[PDB]
């Protein structure tokens, strides 16, 4: 139960907290974008 679907489950949520990993370092760019001189 637990090892195969909440494993499934758990490693959705490795991909999930991976995508907001690669968003906020496009933010921290944004903020290259936006800084100082
Ligand atoms: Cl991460």
Same mark, same amino acid.
């Given at each position: 139960? %637990?090892? #195969? %679907?909440?494993? #499934? /489950?758990? =490693?959705?949520?490795?991909? /999930? =907290?991976? @995508? /907001?990993? #690669? #968003? $906020?370092? $496009? $933010? =921290?760019?944004? =903020?290259?974008?936006?800084?100082? @001189?």
């Amino acid at each position: 139960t %637990w090892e #195969a %679907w909440d494993x #499934a /489950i758990a =490693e959705y949520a490795x991909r /999930i =907290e991976x @995508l /907001i990993x #690669a #968003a $906020q370092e $496009q $933010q =921290e760019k944004n =903020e290259x974008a936006l800084x100082e @001189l």
